[model samples]
Target: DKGPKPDGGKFLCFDHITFYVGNAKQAASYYTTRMGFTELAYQGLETGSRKLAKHVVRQNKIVFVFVSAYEPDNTELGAHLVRHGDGVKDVAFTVEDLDVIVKRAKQRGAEVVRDIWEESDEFGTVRFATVKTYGDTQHTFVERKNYKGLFLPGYKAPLYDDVLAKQLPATHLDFIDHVVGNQPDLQMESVAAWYEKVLMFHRFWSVDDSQIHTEYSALRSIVMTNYEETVKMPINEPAKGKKKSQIEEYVDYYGGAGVQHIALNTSDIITAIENLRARGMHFLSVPNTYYDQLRERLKSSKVKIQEDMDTLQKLNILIDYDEDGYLLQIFTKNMQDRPTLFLEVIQRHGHNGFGAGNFKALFEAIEAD
Candidate 1:
């Protein structure tokens, strides 16, 4: 399916994700070792960034900035970690027009953390502005149309390189497909509304508990996107259910509403999962019965899958298809010991969905855990 259109947005794509952690070096090691992300850049005491140390890692187009407060009295990053415990601090977006968005966001009563600021180096000038969102997470609008450096002005090329990334098979996970945000009970609608009111976002997809309920858990989700549909963020909230819900589980441990997971888009999910598995990456699993019914379900549908059903089944990749097309995706098990943040490798054939048909299977497997 072509899916819904956006109301026109300025967002081009995800600029990068910045994480606030207690140990930036170890956090960098996790993604580089487990996810095949290459160490790309660094800014710390060695680079004259006195208050904090930032380790920038990249794999293809995906860039993750890990920050740790070197000083004990570093209030901002310190307070963030104390409340949320090693989570995404800034969901920066690459936008075309920073001036227009900053003006509109201010008119709409958005809490602007940083006014339009410019930083220039030999690479050129980049403009940035920050706006407060749900919980401690902030949306930083980055206009880097003129900049051409590895990252930004202050940040230099990768110094602390990960030689292991060169040896591993390429994951080929390019860019962000979407990011999910988990909200408290009964808060899904309001947060979705915020995207509409604050930014020029529109509803791409929505579902109630009735359509997404298992024996023990239920959730409500509304997919929000910009005009170009380049940036997708789905807001989810726990719904009434028999046992403790997964959404509730995340909200409890995450402390409050925050980013649930970041989905990475790939051209070839089969090879991607295989390469990651070879690198010690573990993922959420499904039963043989799910694959047993896959061919039967798609028999009547018009969408024809190109990948082998046996390969998909072997990798435990879930399929969601419509009359138009289908998509292949698999979610990794908890990246950390706690079930706070994980990742999804997604490949879309012609469908523009979030695997709605696999919800029951996925939820059932999650409940079994």
Candidate 2:
């Protein structure tokens, strides 16, 4: 419910995320059993999609689409697999007026990956379009004009409900908070400007290396947001530090700049992680020293503490705030085999920051690992 929202042709919430994987079925099972998302819709040979098989899962407002090539020989998805290896390809978004957004995007020199089109069925019609963005990642604009379908027209409801999601209560995880992208050295500003000039986004917040850094590494980030503040994309680049920066390492292992992580919004992170743990999710552990020092750090600070300090310390959830309010956040271990993609479960009280205050300890923890 809380995110970026721009002016006309407003860029609404994130539609869904698409991951190209080796086995869509296996990937689908992983999210269901481990991440707490249920099988929502699916498409493939049974649905007449001969070359590709896709599985869609949803939890609250979050949706993830996993696609695998069936008759793989030579194609774009295959090439993407060859390069990035089972990573995010498309970050689709919902919009009110597709024509207005596409026209303005074209007028601003954005490359049109797909022309405007519509797919209608017994349910209703959906307007769709696509545009190329930084790297191989694409932005798909989906305008569902009162279409009350399961997902899109082609996708049908899942044959069965997820065993884990059914056994458990409602999910604590809500919608996507923001997605961060790692950029090559000196490329952050340009890529950020593209969102501003092409998509009509504005710089929401930013941090320089001087403000956020670790002893061994540092980074500079600029958060871009729509007028409605429903979509936030923070672009980060490597910066001067004592050693090779974390952003650089991500760029190296990921083959290039790509989505570094996706932050998931939550109402209660305690229940979220507890439930996530019950579902088999693994998070990066923090040293006992971090919690010890954090106690003194919060005592000196002026922000009023709400949750029990003992519980927070025991759970190892990092806190970030000043006087207005504080936010509770915890991170997951790398989602893939490579140290590239990860997840963040964050609950904001009244702050608008992206947890800059906790960067030092967080990186120090990562550095120790």
Pick the lDDT winner: 1
Q: lDDT by residue for model 1 over 1-369, one digit each (tens)?
A: 323443343889999999999899899988988897888889998889988899999888899999998888788888878777888888999998788888888888789899999988888899999999888889999999957887988897766555777788888899889999999988999888888878878877532222554443467788888877789998988986666678998989889989989999999999999899999998876877787667886777778899988999889888987777788999998866667888999999887888866866566555555
Candidate 1: Cα lDDT at 51: 86
lDDT of 1: 0.84
TM-score of each: 0.93, 0.93
User: lDDT scores for all predictions?
Assistant: 0.84, 0.83
Least accurate stretch of 10 residues (summed lDDT) in model 2? 206-215
Candidate 2 Cα misplacement greater than 4 A, ranges: 1-7, 168-170, 206-210, 214-217, 364-369
| Model 2 quality (TM-score) | 0.93
Worst 10 residues of 1 by lDDT: 206-215
Which residue pairs come into collision in candidate 1?
8-227, 9-227
For model 1, state the Cα shift of residue 149 in Å: 1.1
